[PDB]
């Protein structure tokens, strides 16, 4: 598969100045600035011809970039503080996802003769990143609102011209092959309890590359994480999650509780680790830290953005089923599980999150068809649910044919819908 990352999002590039004659560029040097009115400190992004930085550009949904450093894992930040001539200093800072950490790259120049370069703009191209005063001297990087047109050529523009030089490869995990969802597993005897979730056959349906800056992995420092796990792998899988398994005596009606959805604990876990969680429509919801990448992520996962603000919770329902057979029958019901797995580049599993989709479910039995008659749902009651996004029950009686997937929205419900 292909997540379709740009070349600059797959490499830590050394950014050199286009017009520098002595190989000056963005640096991590510990020496202070040599220019008079260009003060430096520990947070300053330096400019020097030694100790070069290697920077990756994470692509946001809107096209702008996050600039992160390979060694300390911090990102470029436009500080709100004012310098001389009302300029903002560019500093190193932990990723927050604020607007001050977003930069727009604009290419210009002679593309035909390969003499092109690029600049970085902020605040809707009202400010451009520029060296402080010097081209071939140790100085700092800043944001200035003093933008000149490229024609007629201004000397001050040269302080803003960047090119790509040497690079390190970003650590990128391979995407798994997609597979098809199996048929609902059949019991082989009256004593067969069916297939538990731990043994259920998974089908890969999607995968996404997550920048390490949005992933919370406390087992690694930010340096190792940025360099060895630049992108985490989030794979989306599906399997048949068993709701219950029971022998139902001949001509008997039994009460069975069906627990689906997802617990608040699991939701909070995914929120803490990825700032993502599941909506009541089983679509993806995002918080501030990772919201900037939600469109790329969902296109890779093949799971839609949620269209509701309601958070998916646990769903406890009590169902009554009738066995219309002249014999005791082993019945087992499965519902569709939606599984998300966070992996490192090496393949190690960081965490799992599963939501059980009650809207897609089915029943199998032993003895199987055509020996036995299909089970019948005769009563449906919602016992516990903390939201009313779906307060509908099935219109009973409803027949669950063996192996058939019952889609809740394709059946008659109470209260009535689509009518």
């Amino acid at each position: 598969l292909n997540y379709n990352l740009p070349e600059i999002s797959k490499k830590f590039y050394n950014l050199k100045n286009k017009y520098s004659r002595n190989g000056y560029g963005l640096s991590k040097t510990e020496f202070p600035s040599s220019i008079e009115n260009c003060p430096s400190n520990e947070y300053s992004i330096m400019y020097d011809n030694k100790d070069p930085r290697f920077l990756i550009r994470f692509l946001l949904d809107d096209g702008r970039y996050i600039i992160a450093d390979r060694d300390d894992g911090e990102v470029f930040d436009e500080a709100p503080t004012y310098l001389d001539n009302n300029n903002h200093p560019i500093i190193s800072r932990h990723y927050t996802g604020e607007e001050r950490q977003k930069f727009e790259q604009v290419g210009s120049g002679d593309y035909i003769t390969g003499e092109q370069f690029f600049q970085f703009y902020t605040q809707n191209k009202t400010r451009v990143l520029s060296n402080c005063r010097a081209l071939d001297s140790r100085t700092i990087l800043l944001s200035t609102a003093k933008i000149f047109p490229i024609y007629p050529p201004a000397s001050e523009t040269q302080l803003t011209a960047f090119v790509n030089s040497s690079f390190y490869a970003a650590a990128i995990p391979q995407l798994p092959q997609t597979s098809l969802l199996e048929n609902i597993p059949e019991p082989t005897s009256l004593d067969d309890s069916g297939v538990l979730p731990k043994d259920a056959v998974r089908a890969v349906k999607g995968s996404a590359l997550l920048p390490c800056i949005i992933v919370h992995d406390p087992n690694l420092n930010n340096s190792d994480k940025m360099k060895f796990n630049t992108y985490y792998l989030l794979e989306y899988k599906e399997y048949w999650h068993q709701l219950w398994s029971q022998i139902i005596p001949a001509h008997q009606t039994v009460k069975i509780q069906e627990r689906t959805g997802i617990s608040e604990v699991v939701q909070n876990s995914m929120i803490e680790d990825l700032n993502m969680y599941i909506g009541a429509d089983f679509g993806m919801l995002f918080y501030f830290r990772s919201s900037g990448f939600k469109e790329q992520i969902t296109r890779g996962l093949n799971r839609p953005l949620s269209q509701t603000t309601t958070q998916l919770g646990e769903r406890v329902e009590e169902m009554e089923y009738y066995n219309s057979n002249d014999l005791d029958v082993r019945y087992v019901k499965y519902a569709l599980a939606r599984e998300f797995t966070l992996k490192r580049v090496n393949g190690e599993i960081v965490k799992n999150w599963v939501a059980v989709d009650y809207r897609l479910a089915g029943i199998q039995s032993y003895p199987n068809a055509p020996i036995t008659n299909p089970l019948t749902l005769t009563k449906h009651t919602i016992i516990r649910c903390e939201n009313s996004y779906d307060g509908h029950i099935f219109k009973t009686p409803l027949i669950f044919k063996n192996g058939e997937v019952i889609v809740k929205t394709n059946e008659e419900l109470i209260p009535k819908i689509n009518q």
């Binding site: 292909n2 379709n4 469109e295 779906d390 997937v405 929205t409 689509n418």
Partner: protein
């Protein structure tokens, strides 16, 4: 049969009939027969004026077109009107699901992303326009239900292939194929309202509401010659895209090619640039400069001590616009040549790669 499909109907693309949930009388949302006019609630009549298709965009928002003439929901001063799609911010709506069965339509002020209003009628007993309201929380007068849901039959899209292979020469006299075998890199779906065609918008909505753009790559022959031992020859090579081709694609699918070989999206297709590039495995341009046609001259030297057949190939990307029946729309080729990716087919195969000399641009 051994596989199960997990695709749920409501998460796909379909035609819908809309009515307001609180309405007792059988009123449906009704688009005017004229291209321009007020959106109204009228008695449900099974007319194409009451059948709508929501075209999803990158950020989840939708473009709401009717099945009669293809005009879309257009937000104005105090109410919503029907008008021709232009890519205006006022023609993008969000479908917010309060429950599994009910939803409201929200539009946000392009002047402020905080000012969001929902659509609401001023009557349930009489025909009414769709007005704005700021009272959204616990207000059921904005809730809309789907009276009907008719699922579309999308065209069959081709499977993605890997990158095209460099042609292999059979002998010394073999100049090789003018083009290699075409490889399909990707394809993407595009709403009929964003393309140019001789079919009316209303008819497109009924028979081919979705078009699709195909992205194929292949090696294009530039030159071929039998190089004497130690011989230095000058060859002419082209790169980029012709003015005719740029104009045709721009008018065709509202997409242009930037000078960085990234895609420039116009007002119509800007809302789907994320999905377009992802499906076609392309990138959005970062420059404001357009790709043009350039003619180079490059010197090549055969360093071998024996005659060697050489043939120069340049990587080509072609885009084609197709209807739902698979027919190609554009009669003018939308092709871009990228000289950053060139390959030199050779006979004999073990011969070394030609030594590149000086490169000069032809200013005709």
């Amino acid at each position: 049969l051994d596989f199960i499909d997990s695709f749920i109907p409501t998460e796909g693309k379909y035609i819908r009939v809309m009515d307001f949930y609180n309405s007792e009388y059988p009123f449906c949302i009704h688009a005017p027969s004229a291209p321009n006019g007020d959106i109204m609630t009228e008695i449900c009549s099974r007319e194409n004026n009451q059948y709508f298709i929501f075209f999803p965009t990158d950020d989840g928002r939708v473009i709401i077109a009717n099945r009669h003439n293809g005009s879309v929901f257009t937000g104005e001063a105090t109410s919503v009107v029907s008008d021709i799609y232009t890519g205006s911010p006022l023609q993008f709506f969000r479908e917010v699901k309060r429950t599994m069965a009910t939803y409201y339509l929200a539009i946000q002020n392009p002047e402020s992303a905080t000012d969001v209003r929902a659509l609401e009628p001023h009557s349930h007993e009489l025909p009414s326009r769709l007005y704005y309201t700021n009272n959204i929380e616990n207000n059921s007068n904005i809730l809309i239900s789907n009276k009907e849901q008719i699922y579309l039959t999308l065209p069959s899209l081709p499977e993605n292939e890997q990158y095209p292979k460099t042609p292999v020469l059979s002998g010394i006299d073999d100049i090789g194929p003018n083009q290699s075998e075409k490889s399909i890199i990707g394809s993407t779906l595009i709403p009929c309202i964003m393309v140019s065609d001789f079919i009316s918008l209303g008819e497109r909505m009924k028979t081919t509401p979705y078009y699709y753009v195909k992205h194929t790559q292949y090696w294009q022959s530039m030159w071929s010659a039998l190089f004497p031992p130690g011989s230095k020859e000058t060859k002419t090579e082209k790169s980029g895209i012709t003015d005719t081709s740029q104009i045709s694609m721009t008018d065709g699918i509202n997409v242009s090619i930037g000078a960085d070989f990234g895609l420039r999206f116009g007002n119509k297709t800007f809302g789907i640039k994320g999905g377009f590039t992802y499906d076609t495995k392309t990138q959005i341009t970062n420059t404001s400069q357009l790709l043009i046609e350039t003619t180079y001259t490059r010197e090549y030297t055969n360093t071998e001590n024996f005659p060697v057949r050489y043939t120069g190939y340049v990587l080509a990307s072609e885009f084609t616009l197709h209807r739902s029946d698979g027919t190609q729309v554009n009669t003018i080729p939308w092709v871009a040549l990228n000289d950053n990716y060139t390959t030199i087919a050779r006979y004999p195969h073990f011969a070394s790669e030609p030594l590149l000399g000086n490169t000069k641009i032809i200013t005709d």
